[PDB]
Ligand binder design. Structure first.
Ligand SMILES: CCN(CC)CCNS(=O)(=O)c1ccc(Oc2c(Cl)cccc2[N+](=O)[O-])cc1
Ligand SMILES: CCN(CC)CCNS(=O)(=O)c1ccc(Oc2c(Cl)cccc2[N+](=O)[O-])cc1
Ligand SMILES: CCN(CC)CCNS(=O)(=O)c1ccc(Oc2c(Cl)cccc2[N+](=O)[O-])cc1
Ligand SMILES: CCN(CC)CCNS(=O)(=O)c1ccc(Oc2c(Cl)cccc2[N+](=O)[O-])cc1
Ligand SMILES: *[C@@H]1O[C@H](CO)[C@@H](O)[C@H](O)[C@H]1NC(C)=O
Ligand SMILES: *[C@@H]1O[C@H](CO)[C@@H](O)[C@H](O)[C@H]1NC(C)=O
Ligand SMILES: *[C@H]1O[C@H](CO)[C@@H](O)[C@H](O)[C@H]1NC(C)=O
Ligand SMILES: *[C@H]1O[C@H](CO)[C@@H](O)[C@H](O)[C@H]1NC(C)=O
Lengths: 534, 535
């Protein structure tokens, strides 16, 4: 019985497992319940804290993945499968994971909390690319990740009703954060230094914790990778959430709010997932059926209203995007695209794909987009059209949303560091044309190249160490810069005046100004005036 | 006769002419100045189409320049060379339909390609007698026969009550066409070749050339065309029948006046009264807008220039088109607050927003917003120097560079042989401030070969450059191709095509070929704005 693996939290005793990382052992505690199983009558409802337990709870194993849609576009292809659930699916899924160094830290140690993405319809903390052992071993960090309910189970809402008020998936995350405040000190964690980081939908969630006051006393710093709470996909209005929820009930055969949610509770999990996609208003990509809702509760107003007016004086944030944000999505709806060919498109297919990548666009707004992205030197050239299609999706959904957030935060007192990630993995399985797709910086942040058996290059390994350093230095201090290291060029704060950001890749840090400034001005400043002239 | 130079006596359909032996740096040239080509359009002929000049008796003296067509005279910078050089240099009169001819001395042995100059000046000003239009250098150095004509400008040239007979409009254009017919009948008497005639003009003159390409009766009067910083399409060169009526009607009121009665009362007005109120009929506060310009009458212009260029066949048409590097700057000091030739014109963001509305007067609030968003540098949105240069570029692109791009793009796609250039050299002798770069109209002095004049204090490189330009233009006149046949070692000037969008830079350095004529920005003006404005 290893006493390093024995921990007492407020709910009872836990037994963890000693895992081997390349540089040494780490203490892992996997499958720790933080809520009562949100099953039966608890479906669609806010989570409740986990009841105390007897004896020693076995926390040596990953728990079940929250019930969710499992992707089928490319069956058995490692590029898509690496994101699919690697455990059994269950509604009973509210568990978190903790990695610490072995032996347990003597001094209180900065805490990183990871929130996965997956469009708020999917994801799990058990995925191999979320393995916290590397950051724990190498950087001596304490790393936490939770499962939260996705899809209908986490975000279906009849706004204003008591039995489906919406945003419960976000409340799951909030509860896990409270759990860290109450318990992390027992793992050697510092509850007075908690950094949230997340990617895509996870970055958006982190964003919403910034914007929801009850979450604010539970963390001190934030990192948003390729996702924002603002933007076209991360939230819906109370009106639209209600429409979709009502439609889904209709598709599965279902006080009218009360009776409707009751019939839904009798439905087998897979029955809801079966029709989950059928409630989107238009044919689209980068749109998800059940996402956070502007309830006037978790989110008092829209994310844009909130960032446009909020006071972010004592906040420190690290934000960024990968080089080819939109490429991944094209194969998932835009005719002409595939991972099995170069995806060279005609002008016709480019026009058609623009109504899909910008589903909310009027005829005139989509005309504006097509005219902005066409290279008038090569207006017909297939390679340019394919690359521009991908840029439209990435800019509309990620890059410009990010630029807007970085800008509003910086102006209103927040401390901001911005990056773009430009290194394509040598082990990447998607075709060359997709470039550096949405989500492929993650494996580097988490330290995976340090595992010899993954066959990353030495340079990639050296690079992963650099990134773990930036992230953890940022966690320690709110500044990704090494504190006593001179040489290695400095990473400056993003500001509204100078708009400085850096490129993360194999070469030394390079400072650039303006994050797609002209193009984002088009999305962030002009288009809203246009669509509002409809 | 008896004792005069026998090389200066010539007969044309209207009678005998005595010209003058002018000195040019390289040798003598013959000038025939002030040849009348129409009956003086005065009295009850005001606003009417020109009638052909009636034969005279005796030998008409053609040694001096004739009257300048009655016009507004610029008062912004009194005595300043940069404006004055464009002002009338002869007496102002409604009796002003005269043309000038320069030929080699003695007159050429074989038929020589003819060049016809059409001056610009916004259809409200201009004269063929300006120093900068001196054909003596082209004639001496290239052996060219050069013809320039006066045509009516302003109200007298373009006031129209469309559909009426007393003021059908476009009579200024008909003045030009009559001179073209004059050249057809008479130029061979000077040794010119009537079957090889190339029109060339700058600004409004260029637009005029464009109108002649688009007007059936003009088409048999020339063979090749050059358009310098102006197009028949675009925001300023034409007005609809409706708008012209509104402006004629308003100008009548402002001077105290059934279309017959109205027009008859205008004919009673002293010419200066019509000129004094000419600017007052513009619908909005603007720059690069002129009150009386060609109208779409469905006669001279059977439809809008835009329609015509989009749907016309232009096989076997050869055109040279181009622009200067800073088309817009000149206009800013005449209307956009913050701009002056006497300071650096560093403006604020506020002044930029105000200025956009003035330089794009026909834009809704949203269209104006789009222009500001497109032209703003978002890395430095408040930088006075960028804002100043952006203002210039907004005006220049909207009015010239993008209409020229559209023109070249349509003509090329529809069969024409098109050659395109950008003129990038700032004259060492330029009196405008540096910030204005290479302004509208400052390629002209080089095309005409003024630097060859020793007393003008240009540089040796400017002299050589000027000579290169005269060769391009004259080679194009002769062949339809600006390249020297022998000189193949020197870099070639490729045709402009839709596929490759090639044009050349014209500066002190050898020809550099570039691709795309403000391709991205012009997609905004030419493709997107018309969609936006119509909503
Ligand atoms: C009915 C309303 N208009 S519609 O065009 O038919 C429609 C409705 C729902 C849609 O959702 C789906 C579905 Cl079901 C399957 C696959 C992908 C998506 N999507 O948009 O990502 C797509 C189109
Ligand atoms: C979380 C990290 N990420 C990195 C690629 C892995 C995948 N999650 S993700 O990036 O949100 C994501 C990616 C592709 C998606 O395509 C679909 C699909 Cl599968 C079904 C229906 C509709 C669409 N669509 O976009 O219209 C959806 C979500
Ligand atoms: C509401 N329209 S307005 O602001 O009264 C108006 C209309 C026409 C104007 O014409 C002029 C005049 Cl008069 C003088 C100088 C320049 C111009 N111009 O427009 O270029 C000036 C102002
Ligand atoms: C043809 C050669 N050109 C070269 C610059 C010389 C001058 N003609 S021009 O270029 O059309 C020209 C230039 C500026 C002008 O400004 C004025 C003026 Cl002067 C008076 C009243 C109103 C405005 N305006 O634009 O609003 C007018 C005509
Ligand atoms: C390289 O890594 C792979 C796993 O991706 C492993 O299976 C293999 O044994 C390693 N070396 C090779 C190429 O055999
Ligand atoms: C040219 O230069 C001389 C001085 O060498 C000067 O007197 C003359 O006025 C100048 N001419 C012009 C037109 O600038
Ligand atoms: C590969 O792309 C092409 C179009 O460029 C298309 O034929 C096909 O849908 C894609 N892949 C396959 C084999 O389905
Ligand atoms: C030039 O100076 C400033 C711009 O630097 C401008 O505001 C002003 O109007 C101009 N001065 C004059 C004399 O008009």
């Amino acid at each position: 019985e290893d006493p390093q693996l024995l921990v007492r939290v407020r709910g009872g005793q836990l037994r963890g497992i000693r895992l081997k990382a390349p540089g040494g052992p780490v203490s892992a505690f996997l499958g720790i319940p933080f809520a009562e199983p949100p099953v039966g009558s608890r479906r669609f409802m806010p989570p409740e804290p986990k009841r105390p337990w007897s004896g020693v709870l076995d926390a040596t194993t990953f728990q079940n993945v929250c019930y969710q849609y499992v992707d089928t576009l490319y069956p058995g292809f490692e590029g898509t499968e690496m994101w699919n659930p690697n455990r059994e699916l269950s509604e009973d899924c509210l568990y978190l994971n903790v990695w610490t160094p072995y032996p347990r830290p003597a001094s209180p140690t900065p805490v990183l909390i990871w929130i996965y993405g997956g469009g708020f319809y999917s994801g799990a903390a058990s995925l191999d690319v979320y393995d916290g052992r590397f950051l724990a071993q190498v950087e001596g960090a304490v790393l936490v990740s939770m499962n939260y309910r996705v899809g209908t189970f986490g975000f279906l809402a009849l706004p204003g009703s008591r039995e489906a008020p919406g945003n419960v998936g976000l409340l799951d995350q909030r509860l896990a954060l409270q759990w860290v405040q109450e318990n992390i000190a027992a793992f050697g964690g510092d509850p007075m230094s908690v950094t949230l980081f997340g990617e895509s939908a996870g970055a958006a969630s982190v964003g919403m914790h910034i914007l929801s006051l009850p979450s604010r006393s539970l963390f001190h710093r934030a990192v948003l990778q390729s996702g924002t709470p603002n933007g076209p996909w991360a939230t819906v209005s109370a009106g639209e959430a209600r429409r979709r929820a009502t439609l889904l009930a209709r598709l599965v055969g279902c006080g009218n709010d009360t009776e409707l949610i009751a019939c839904l509770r009798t439905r087998p999990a897979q029955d809801l997932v079966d029709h989950e996609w059928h409630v989107l208003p238009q044919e689209s990509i980068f749109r998800f059926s059940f996402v956070p809702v502007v309830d006037g509760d978790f989110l008092s107003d829209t994310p844009e209203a909130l960032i446009n007016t909020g006071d972010f004086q004592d906040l420190q944030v690290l934000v960024g995007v990968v080089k080819d944000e939109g490429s991944y999505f094209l194969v998932y709806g835009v005719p002409g695209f595939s991972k099995d060919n170069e995806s060279l498109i005609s002008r016709a297919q480019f026009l058609a794909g623009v109504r899909i990548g910008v589903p909310q666009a009027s005829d005139l707004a989509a005309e504006a987009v097509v005219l902005h992205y066409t290279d008038w030197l090569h207006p017909e050239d297939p390679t340019h059209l394919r690359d521009a299609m991908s840029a439209v999706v990435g800019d509309h959904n990620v890059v410009c949303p990010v630029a807007q957030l970085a800008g509003r935060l910086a102006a209103q007192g927040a401390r901001v560091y911005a990056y773009i990630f430009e290194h394509r993995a040598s082990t990447l399985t998607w075709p060359l044309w997709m470039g550096v797709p949405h989500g492929y910086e993650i494996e580097f942040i988490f330290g995976l190249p340090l595992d010899p058996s993954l066959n990353y290059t030495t340079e990639e390994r050296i690079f992963a160490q650099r990134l773990m350093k930036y992230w953890t230095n940022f966690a320690r201090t709110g500044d990704p810069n090494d504190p006593r290291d001179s040489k290695s060029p400095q990473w400056p704060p993003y500001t509204t005046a100078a708009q400085q950001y850096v490129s993360l890749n194999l070469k030394p840090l390079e400072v650039r100004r303006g994050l797609r400034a002209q193009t984002c001005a088009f999305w962030n400043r002009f288009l809203p005036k246009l669509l509002s002239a409809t």
